[PDB]
């Protein structure tokens, strides 16, 4: 798990 998400970060 990176605990990072572009979709979440941009949302």
């Amino acid at each position, epitope marked *: 798990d*990176s605990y990072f998400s572009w979709s979440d970060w941009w949302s």
Partner: antibody
């Protein structure tokens, strides 16, 4: 082989709607965001929005709020863009591109061949 | 609403010549992304996170900059490098591109 195969060219009357598709293969469909981009007559590029099939989450450019609608079918590895109330301004080539969601060091590493839309009476 | 201004819009170079081209931001951006496009073909990723080359991009290419001023540079021009280059920012929604810098062969 990673590949994004887009739908063929489309000629549509002003005021009608059209539904472009972007079929993905060669990778886990739910791990990558699909961005949509607009280009008129080999000009500059313009970001429309994206759909992440991992969570079902969607985001639009404010400009394309009331123009574009993004949806997906997980069982066919396909993301759709529906364009509504078409004018000559919407005549352009439309590209899809994948972007790994869970990696900060991600870039738009694979692109579709493009779909040409023409709007004319 | 972040506007990216790419200069020059047109430039020419002989093979062997060094090529620098700028992307200028109307506001501050954390990092810049670059793309190469040639006629009748979809754009290709070239640079990501300001100075990191995309997979398969030759070592002669490099990126630089911070805040409001970014640049893409070719140490030694080659014929195959003749294309249009676009910058893009991810810092501020909406995501925005430059108008492009077109690089042509000299003769």
């Amino acid at each position: 082989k990673v590949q994004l195969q887009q739908s063929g060219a489309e000629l549509v009357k002003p005021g009608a709607s059209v539904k472009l598709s972007c079929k993905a293969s060669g990778y886990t469909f739910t791990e990558y965001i699909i961005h949509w981009v607009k280009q008129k007559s080999g000009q500059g590029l313009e970001w429309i929005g994206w759909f992440y099939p991992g969570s079902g989450n969607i985001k639009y450019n404010e400009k394309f709020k009331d123009k574009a609608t993004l949806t997906a079918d997980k069982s066919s590895s396909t993301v759709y863009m529906e364009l509504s109330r078409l004018t000559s301004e919407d005549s352009a080539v439309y590209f899809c591109a994948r972007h790994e969601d869970r990696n900060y060091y991600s870039y738009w590493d694979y692109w579709g061949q493009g779909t040409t839309l023409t709007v004319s009476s | 609403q972040i506007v990216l201004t790419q200069s020059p819009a047109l430039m020419s170079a002989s093979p062997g010549e060094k090529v620098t081209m700028t992307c200028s931001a109307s506001s501050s951006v954390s990092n810049m992304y670059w793309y190469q496009q040639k006629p009748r073909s979809s754009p290709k990723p070239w640079i990501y996170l300001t100075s990191n080359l995309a997979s398969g991009v030759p070592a002669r290419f490099s990126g630089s900059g911070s805040g409001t001023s970014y640049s893409l540079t070719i140490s030694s021009m080659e014929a195959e490098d003749a294309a249009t280059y676009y910058c893009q920012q991810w810092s501020s929604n909406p995501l925005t591109f430059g108008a492009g810098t077109k690089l042509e062969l000299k003769r």
